[PDB]
Design a protein around this ligand. Structure first.
Ligand SMILES: [Zn+2]
Length: 358
């Protein structure tokens, strides 16, 4: 019941100070990398994007896995959607008056992601080896985003993502996304869509010089300012359980991944999937009275049941790009989704024995 869920949440709090100090090490390394990058003429105006709960810029997606985004203001953006994929784009430049600092990365009229990543990597691996003080290990990663994974000390690994910043209107593929009007209001949806959007070098399936839309800054804003009431969670009368439900869903997936590690059935699933499903459940349940702290058990069941539906139907829409299905067969194979469906179903039907202490 909810008492078991509350106990899980209390257990997770015991890790807080270890996370804070570990995020503190990520922070110091990143601050160092930022100042060196700014020396290169192409990465002049590089900066840290506000996406995380630690020091504005350090984000957790799983215990000991930290996430940091480097933003780069790139004016005159011009996007060309890569063949009906809705989330992947070629990057061109609207006009030519000044020759852009990223001229070096052009292959024709198109900004090369793999060219720009190579320099980004070269500069980082240059400073990572040019540090006597602390051993910091770079592992060139799977492809595109994240660009670099550093390994600090033993278990701390920070992913570092480069992101182009566009202050232009969001692409047409987002026009029916961010369906927050009945929850956070039409006024807020308008304000959020006036903010920049970001492009990360992720490559569509093998390769291409494509970039993927990213809204990590908006995700943080709507998790931290998450109520229909402006004063949700600002006083003792308005304590909702939205953040606790997302935490429990992330922990559920983390624990199942560890239990099913012998055959790695669940490798493709991520906290981003559970976060996306959670945002959809917020749209479905827009009133703060549907997230009363006393109803933690029912609220968590709402979240789990919707995630199960996404698995069984093999459909999880990106919250910002509705026609981008995170659970398509191109991204996650059918047998993986069928397998997780069965395990989530079992957990729900048995009151989550994966959360048992005995
Ligand atoms: Zn709240």
């Amino acid at each position: 019941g909810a008492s078991k869920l509350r106990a899980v949440l209390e257990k997770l709090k015991l890790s807080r100070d270890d996370i804070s100090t570990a995020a503190g090490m990520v922070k110091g390394v990143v601050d160092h990398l930022l100042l060196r990058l700014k020396c290169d003429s192409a990465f002049r105006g590089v900066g840290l994007l506000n996406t995380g709960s630690y020091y504005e810029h350090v984000k957790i997606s799983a215990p000991n896995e930290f996430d940091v985004m480097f933003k780069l203001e790139v004016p005159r953006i011009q996007l060309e959607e890569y063949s009906n994929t809705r989330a992947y784009y070629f990057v061109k430049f609207k006009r030519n008056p000044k020759e852009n600092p990223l001229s070096q990365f052009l292959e024709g009229e198109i900004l090369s992601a793999s060219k720009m990543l190579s320099k980004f990597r070269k500069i980082i691996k240059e400073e990572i080896n040019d540090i006597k003080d602390t051993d910091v290990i770079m592992k060139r990663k799977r492809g595109g985003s994240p660009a670099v994974t550093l390994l600090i000390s033993e278990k701390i690994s920070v992913d570092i993502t480069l992101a182009l910043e566009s202050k232009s209107s969001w692409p047409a593929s987002t026009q029916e996304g961010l369906r927050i009007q009945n929850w956070l209001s039409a006024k807020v949806r308008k304000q959020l869509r006036l903010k920049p959007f970001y492009l990360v070098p992720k490559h569509a399936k093998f390769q291409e010089e494509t970039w993927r839309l990213s809204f990590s800054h908006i995700e943080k804003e709507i998790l931290n300012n998450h109520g229909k009431s402006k004063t949700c969670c600002e006083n003792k009368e308005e304590k909702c359980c939205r953040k606790d439900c997302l935490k429990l869903m992330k922990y559920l997936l983390e624990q199942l991944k560890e239990r099913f590690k012998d055959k790695k059935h669940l490798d493709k699933f991520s906290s981003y999937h559970v976060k996306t499903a959670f945002f959809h459940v917020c749209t479905q349940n827009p009133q703060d009275s549907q997230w009363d702290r006393k109803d933690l058990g029912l609220c968590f069941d709402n979240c789990v049941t919707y995630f199960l539906q996404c698995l069984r139907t093999e459909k999880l829409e990106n919250y910002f790009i509705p026609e981008f299905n995170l659970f398509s067969s191109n991204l996650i194979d059918k047998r993986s989704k069928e397998f997780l469906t069965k395990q989530i179903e079992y957990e729900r039907n048995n009151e989550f024995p994966v959360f048992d202490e005995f």
